[PDB]
Curated annotation (Swiss-Prot), chains A, B:
Function (record text): S1 region attaches the virion to the cell membrane by interacting with host ANPEP/aminopeptidase N, initiating the infection. Binding to the receptor probably induces conformational changes in the S glycoprotein unmasking the fusion peptide of S2 region and activating membranes fusion. S2 region belongs to the class I viral fusion protein. Under the current model, the protein has at least 3 conformational states: pre-fusion native state, pre-hairpin intermediate state, and post-fusion hairpin state.
Subunit structure: Homotrimer. During virus morphogenesis, found in a complex with M and HE proteins. Interacts with host ANPEP.
From-to range in the entire protein, with total length: 972 to 1019 of 1173
Name of the protein: Spike glycoprotein
Gene designation: S
Top-level taxon of the source organism: Viruses
Entry similarity comment: Belongs to the alphacoronaviruses spike protein family.
Organism of derivation: Human coronavirus 229E
Cellular localisation: Virion membrane; Host endoplasmic reticulum-Golgi intermediate compartment membrane
Description of its domains: The KxHxx motif seems to function as an ER retrieval signal.
């Protein structure tokens, strides 16, 4: 299983050791959580 | 409690033994999860 985001306007990034997901239009950062993801069986290697 | 979807553009269906929820505008299928539902007390019999 590979996970993706529920809507496009967000984007992950590696801020430091931890990972932070920000908006695409502003630099405001938001905490990661499990509710923000969605499941798809086929894994693409190109992801984290 | 009866559950419904967080936004209208989705739709459940019984693909096989398991249930799959797809987009209303494309046939792309997405995995079921609990985060995609919402609770309402009154149960309508007309649902699954
Ligand atoms: C999936 O990974 C392949 C690896 O070669 C990459 O070329 C492709 O762009 C990726 N597709 C995506 C991320 O949708
Ligand atoms: C609720 O179920 C009743 C069962 O008679 C049905 O007639 C009605 O259309 C349903 N309402 C919904 C699904 O909003």
């Amino acid at each position: 299983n590979g996970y993706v985001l529920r809507q496009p306007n967000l984007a992950l990034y590696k801020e430091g050791n931890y990972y932070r997901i920000t908006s695409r239009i502003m630099f405001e950062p938001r905490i990661p959580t499990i509710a923000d993801f969605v499941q798809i069986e086929n894994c693409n290697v190109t992801f984290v």
